[PDB]
Amino acid sequence: LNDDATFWRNARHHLVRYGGTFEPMIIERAKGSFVYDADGRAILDFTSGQMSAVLGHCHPEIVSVIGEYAGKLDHLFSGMLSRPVVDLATRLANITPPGLDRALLLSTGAESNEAAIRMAKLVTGKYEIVGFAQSWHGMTGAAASATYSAGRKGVGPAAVGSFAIPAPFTYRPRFERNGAYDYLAELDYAFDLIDRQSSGNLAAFIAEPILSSGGIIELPDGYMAALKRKCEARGMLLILDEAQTGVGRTGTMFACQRDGVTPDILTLSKTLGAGLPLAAIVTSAAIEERAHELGYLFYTTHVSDPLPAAVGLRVLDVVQRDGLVARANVMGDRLRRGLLDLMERFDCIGDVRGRGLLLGVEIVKDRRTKEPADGLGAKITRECMNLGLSMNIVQLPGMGGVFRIAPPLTVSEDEIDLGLSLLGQAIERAL
Amino acid sequence: LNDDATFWRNARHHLVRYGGTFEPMIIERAKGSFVYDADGRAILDFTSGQMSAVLGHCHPEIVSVIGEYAGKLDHLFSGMLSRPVVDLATRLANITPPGLDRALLLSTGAESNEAAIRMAKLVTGKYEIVGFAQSWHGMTGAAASATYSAGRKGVGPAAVGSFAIPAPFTYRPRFERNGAYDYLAELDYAFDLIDRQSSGNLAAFIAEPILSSGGIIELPDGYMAALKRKCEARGMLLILDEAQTGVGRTGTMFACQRDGVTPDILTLSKTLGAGLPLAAIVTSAAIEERAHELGYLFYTTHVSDPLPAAVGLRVLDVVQRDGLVARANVMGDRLRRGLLDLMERFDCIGDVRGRGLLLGVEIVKDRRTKEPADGLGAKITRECMNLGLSMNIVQLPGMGGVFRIAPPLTVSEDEIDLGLSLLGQAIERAL
Amino acid sequence: LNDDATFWRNARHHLVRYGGTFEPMIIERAKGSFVYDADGRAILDFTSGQMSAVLGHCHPEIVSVIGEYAGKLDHLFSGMLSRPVVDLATRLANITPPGLDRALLLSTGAESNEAAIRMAKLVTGKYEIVGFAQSWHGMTGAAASATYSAGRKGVGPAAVGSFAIPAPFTYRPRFERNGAYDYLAELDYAFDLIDRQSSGNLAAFIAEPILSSGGIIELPDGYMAALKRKCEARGMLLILDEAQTGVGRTGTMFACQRDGVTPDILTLSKTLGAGLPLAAIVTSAAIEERAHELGYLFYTTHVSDPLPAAVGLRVLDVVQRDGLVARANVMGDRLRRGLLDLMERFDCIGDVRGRGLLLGVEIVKDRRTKEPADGLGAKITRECMNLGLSMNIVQLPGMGGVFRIAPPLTVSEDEIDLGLSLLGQAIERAL
Amino acid sequence: LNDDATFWRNARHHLVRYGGTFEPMIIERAKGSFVYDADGRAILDFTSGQMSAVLGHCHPEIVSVIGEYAGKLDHLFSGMLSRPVVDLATRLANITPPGLDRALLLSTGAESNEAAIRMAKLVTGKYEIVGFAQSWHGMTGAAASATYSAGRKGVGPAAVGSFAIPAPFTYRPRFERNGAYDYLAELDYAFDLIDRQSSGNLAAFIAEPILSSGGIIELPDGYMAALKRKCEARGMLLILDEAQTGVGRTGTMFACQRDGVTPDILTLSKTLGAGLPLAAIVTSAAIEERAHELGYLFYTTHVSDPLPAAVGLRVLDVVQRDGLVARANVMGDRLRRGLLDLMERFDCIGDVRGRGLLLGVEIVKDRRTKEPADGLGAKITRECMNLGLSMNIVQLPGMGGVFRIAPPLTVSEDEIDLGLSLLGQAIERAL
Numbered sequence A, B, C, D: 001l002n003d004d005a006t007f008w009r010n011a012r013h014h015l016v017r018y019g020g021t022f023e024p025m026i027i028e029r030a031k032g033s034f035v036y037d038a039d040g041r042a043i044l045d046f047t048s049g050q051m052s053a054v055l056g057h058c059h060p061e062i063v064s065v066i067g068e069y070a071g072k073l074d075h076l077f078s079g080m081l082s083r084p085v086v087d088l089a090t091r092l093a094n095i096t097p098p099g100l101d102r103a104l105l106l107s108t109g110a111e112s113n114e115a116a117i118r119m120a121k122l123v124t125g126k127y128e129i130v131g132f133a134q135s136w137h138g139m140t141g142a143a144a145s146a147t148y149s150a151g152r153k154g155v156g157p158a159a160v161g162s163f164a165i166p167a168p169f170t171y172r173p174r175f176e177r178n179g180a181y182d183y184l185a186e187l188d189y190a191f192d193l194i195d196r197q198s199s200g201n202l203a204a205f206i207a208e209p210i211l212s213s214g215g216i217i218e219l220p221d222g223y224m225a226a227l228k229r230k231c232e233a234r235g236m237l238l239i240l241d242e243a244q245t246g247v248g249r250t251g252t253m254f255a256c257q258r259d260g261v262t263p264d265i266l267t268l269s270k271t272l273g274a275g276l277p278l279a280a281i282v283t284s285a286a287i288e289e290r291a292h293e294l295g296y297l298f299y300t301t302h303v304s305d306p307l308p309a310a311v312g313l314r315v316l317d318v319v320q321r322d323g324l325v326a327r328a329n330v331m332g333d334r335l336r337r338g339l340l341d342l343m344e345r346f347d348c349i350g351d352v353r354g355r356g357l358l359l360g361v362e363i364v365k366d367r368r369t370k371e372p373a374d375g376l377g378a379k380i381t382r383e384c385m386n387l388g389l390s391m392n393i394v395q396l397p398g399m400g401g402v403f404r405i406a407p408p409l410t411v412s413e414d415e416i417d418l419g420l421s422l423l424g425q426a427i428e429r430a431l
């Protein structure tokens, strides 16, 4: 049983609580799209873990690679270069758009956003950062100052020069220009305000192409392009955080490829590592050159470490061969349609959005009012669990709870249909 | 050859420069205390990589463990608990001193210091942090605000409430109380100043037991104890950063065990992972309880991930069995004596300090004046390389260049004597 | 002549330039609504100096009072109390609304706003201040951090916790709620944003009832009342800056009396001193009590100084007897109608707003587009001068230049008609 | 009686408490070196009010001048120039040292320091300010961030970039260089620390030549000169706050004349106004030129106002003719010797320091230990009052209470001897 009293004793006495609440089970092993409890029960992993397991759990190629390297090249002194590093950096250069040339290999998502934000502050000579009011960029220092979806209170003052703008949200429009939702004019209205408060030191803007934690909020048409143009006019860099969206998850290698807007700095994470701690920043030669002349510094213990780099190369080799970026669109369409059927069935589902395998279902009390369904989401989530479907819900102010759906890129037709079922039952039994 | 033009082409075109300068070689494989270039040449790794490879490179047990886990349990959703995590947390509870009860498993050194600093700001209700003027705590946001050895200019303003005090330095004493170096009175003098600038929100103090980047600066006798008492009187927490010192490196499990002063939060990193990206924070139940009631949040992608935790448990199992903490003292004494012989031989060596396998040699122009030897250090370092000894030098203002010596805990008698030789030759041929 | 070369020599060699540009004349003497140059030429003072000379220049009663006191009671030690001080404090208590009980007598406008902002930060235990994006609160430290109409760039970072919201502007509406300008919904939209960025330390809001520097922008109907309610809900104080509006200028003793919303702290200045350096803050006993228990401190050289207090009492005695608050409405209506006639005559006049003797004329290229008239304003201002009418124009982004009209409360029917003429001629001859 | 119950009622109900405690008396009139209560009792004003009444109270020339101007030229629009202003600016240029060329006329002490600090931040392009740990520069925003003697807690965070250094204190030496108090080495030690924390944006240093609030702490020999040199090396401006020291009070026009070190910006206040609200900043043409090109702005209601300027010119004309700067040295020597006699008599007096008519007596328990006399100071102060001597005591941490003695420059031989007596009696009757 998952009930092992010694286990839970030790967990209650020696683990620090960092947010949420531990599942009441012991994960014993994982494979593909499933995780197994102590009882042998398979739970269908519909969130790719913490939105990272792009190739699923324990993908045979990742196992080989970790193998070949653990006993060959593990960790090196920060100044020593090695093959996996140079190959990964190069590979990233070729698959990202033209304009993205040099990478820096690191460990976490927030570490990558910090490195990005520090290079832009160096390069520009300024320090003000702007982000969306429902963003998620990390727990560490600067990543946490541009984060607005959560953890903003009780921990002291934020970094100086921190500003936020509202994210364009179609589901629940708020800004209106002559009859309809004018997200571009909201953008201009927002920027006018920033401009009025800036002390003259705008340095960059970080943006998620799709706000994950913020409730799977997809940036509307023509938005990025217009955002990039606001940055251009002020001398600001545009950092795109593709931590949940890069590596095929939305039907393109990088979400920035859809819109056709290449950022100044692109940050990768979750999906790059496929479950491991790997991360990177990709930038243009021009910026890198400039950062180098001014003395840019981002030295860590794990920057350029063989193992991880080696893993990341494989992730990309697999994605490439197996053409998982296309699977993402196909499977992605399969999951979406089903979701919409569910919607036909139940009034609680108020919206289904996202792209490829990065979908979002917004639970609501009633479509007309579009009133948030208080605790119905927790029910659904509890029910899912009992049936063996691991989901995740995010809940923000003025919104209904949103389920984040992000199955592996390697999900099967069956697994998809399965989850779609469990989801149905859980919802049925929850009202 | 290490000369492979395609390699270097790609490295020159696609890598971001983050500090220092890449070695002009290609590391092909690593094992034990050596790294091998493209030519098959073995370079004796006298810095344990980036001061992490406590068990050396590719330690057979670490290879097994990475193996058993890559294909079993890799990465899980942040709320799911698993065995390696609970066992590691528990193990840490038992080996750290009484008073340290609950841990939080993470990925990097700076991530761990951030989590520590955020919990202290939560717990206390304040935000001012004090650190040494020659500290190294990380590149990320808050870790970078308490860092003073480097990267402090050109990247904007630091976090609000940042203060520093001078570290006690015996080698080059500066504060004098009636005839001699009064480090305790320096401490009091320093704290009076802080107290005069504080806005009334002192929350914590981060301190390295031995300042690594700051030139292997060991905190003198009775210092910690007195520091802890300054914190106690003001309501401040004491966070000890044992990133380079924990896990036996100085002859004790944790350096804090020597002085007999248990901190409020203890942070681990480099040596915990033994080369991998693992890190943690260890705290008292009382603080954890309190942080939990106030809503403490430190959610990342890799917090509580099977693989890494699993690795870390092994590191500690090995250390424990092979009694590497004692080897550290024995080998540690062997290296030290030799270093002192060198000192007899050459006038440039102005000081040899540190503890166990975490030694420091301070190059100087002449013992009397104790004048820093300008670029002689670079010579020595260049010469070492040619002979196959990988060393590392740090150079700060008002100091001579300091070689950081930190061979693996598994170093042999031979390897030690060998390095000691190469070191001699390199120094001989450099003047 | 005003041309005196020795004069201008000395002025060019020894005066620091602080903004704008010195008039090319020497004011030799002043009386009533006029100032006289070196040539004896009378210039009709249509701005009451720097919007302060509520009783005009050299009002016989102010001359007596300054007389009786200069040789009797001048300046005292900050702890010594005297009659003029206690009487002024009391008088202010009786004429301000119920709820405003205790005053603090000071010297300048920005000094008063600082004292207000520091008491609110003390009282609340927080530090975030919110103000309008086109506000003017002063040059000193905190007053300057809540100022947004100007001087915001090139002088370093602003105080931490500084935020701004757009002021409701009817002339050039920007926020739209279903067909029309919804200033209340703009308010809510604005506050949602603040709420999203706050670190949980909102302490107060400073607001001008009518934004003077911001282009005579009158806060629309039901606005204050709704603003006060936003503050109430968050635990924030409301500080009203009646520096240009208090003391009858808008047809009420205090502008806050119109709306019927009493602030938490009310700040007075310009009009209180009638040209001298006097200022004050008026607060509720409850807040004062509380500030006192927590150790509130605002000690200056001139706090509670006989002379000034004495002057201020007279200003108020005169206003009261001569019923200048009513004259303000009557004369105020006379000036307004004329202004509107002008408007009929010339297309450049795009709007005439304000209240009582605190009017604003917005120069524009053409009513339809409502395009700002580039430099036509400077013409008009130059022409006025030549004809002997002293005016003042403010020009902000996205607006046309606005003439601030604020003649003394003692202005005559004739003087008004006169100015109205000169104004006509100047405008006629300027296009 | 001073007891008038209506008075005290009104004072208890309508005055805001700003620090200290009101004297329990009603000052009815003042003249020369005395203030008179309601009972007609003359109290000898030994603090020149709030250290401002350099010519005493109600000096016949100041009365004429206030007279000639109140009914002639009072307050003008900020862009209009007038004679008293240009003459005052010029006069200041001629009497200050070579190198100080252009002035800006304002109202208060803290307003002047703000204007100074904002010009240095503009001119340099940086924002860090350094001051002494026992300084007093004002209550307003930036003046308050460089103030360290008091009001530093409970009102939120200070301005970013605020640092302090210890003031050189001979009475209670703390830094020691080989046997003795090495204030210059303290200076260097201090600056090394600043340098280690600076983010690379040091802009200026504000310093009082003699720390008044800090306990009449005179900057030791060769100090200023060395301070100025520390600023020179870093690109920092030196602002001297001569608010209590300028205008002859220490035996020179300006204290900076003693040391022979001309500052970059000199700030005047208290003594310039002689009791009124006048203040100014004096700077070099080079800085002014530069500030002007970059858009320097310091526009207030009272900048360049006839009345005050007019007063200030007279203050200086009187000082000049009556040769009060010399009287200051003569009377100054008379008061000092007497003080020292007192010292012979009573063991409580532990030190008598200062210069000219700006003296300080440090009450202590016993000369050997130099232990601060707890509440003996309050006794002495209470006793003085009863005898009719108005004194003032400041009390800081680690110090004994210090009496600030600063009689008018016009004090008579008799008045001096008188005070010296009362002082004796008060001290006698207090132990």
Ligand SMILES: *Cc1c(COP(=O)(O)O)cnc(C)c1O
Pocket: A107, A108, A109, A110, A111, A113, A136, A137, A138, A139, A208, A212, A241, A243, A244, A269, A270, B299, B300, B301, B302
């Ligand atoms: C997960 C995530 C991060 C941070 O990654 P970590 O590994 O947790 O530091 C940053 N940004 C976004 C948008 C993320 O989704």
Ligand SMILES: *Cc1c(COP(=O)(O)O)cnc(C)c1O
Pocket: A299, A300, A301, A302, B107, B108, B109, B110, B111, B113, B136, B137, B138, B139, B208, B212, B241, B243, B244, B269, B270
């Ligand atoms: C290496 C180090 C760190 C940071 O570890 P990273 O993995 O680089 O983030 C922090 N503190 C000390 C004292 C270190 O030596």
Ligand SMILES: *Cc1c(COP(=O)(O)O)cnc(C)c1O
Pocket: C107, C108, C109, C110, C111, C113, C136, C137, C138, C139, C208, C212, C241, C243, C244, C269, C270, D299, D300, D301, D302
């Ligand atoms: C003029 C003014 C002030 C400042 O008064 P000063 O005497 O210049 O410091 C502050 N607020 C408003 C709204 C003003 O119009």
Ligand SMILES: *Cc1c(COP(=O)(O)O)cnc(C)c1O
Pocket: C299, C300, C301, C302, D107, D108, D109, D110, D111, D113, D136, D137, D138, D139, D208, D212, D241, D243, D244, D269, D270
């Ligand atoms: C009194 C004083 C001030 C401030 O003058 P205020 O008129 O109170 O603003 C500033 N600095 C020093 C050194 C002072 O003594």
Ligand SMILES: [Rb+]
Pocket: A075, A076, A077, A078, A079, A300, A301, A302, A303, A304, A305, B050
């Ligand atoms: Rb590395």
Ligand SMILES: [Rb+]
Pocket: A092, A093, A094, A095, A096, A097, A098, A099, A100, A101
């Ligand atoms: Rb590219």
Ligand SMILES: [Rb+]
Pocket: A050, B075, B076, B077, B078, B079, B300, B301, B302, B303, B304, B305
């Ligand atoms: Rb995890």
Ligand SMILES: [Rb+]
Pocket: B092, B093, B094, B095, B096, B097, B098, B099, B100, B101
């Ligand atoms: Rb323990």
Ligand SMILES: [Rb+]
Pocket: C075, C076, C077, C078, C079, C300, C301, C302, C303, C304, C305, D050
């Ligand atoms: Rb006073």
Ligand SMILES: [Rb+]
Pocket: C092, C093, C094, C095, C096, C097, C098, C099, C100, C101
């Ligand atoms: Rb009232």
Ligand SMILES: [Rb+]
Pocket: C050, D075, D076, D077, D078, D079, D300, D301, D302, D303, D304, D305
């Ligand atoms: Rb003026």
Ligand SMILES: [Rb+]
Pocket: D092, D093, D094, D095, D096, D097, D098, D099, D100, D101
């Ligand atoms: Rb001069």
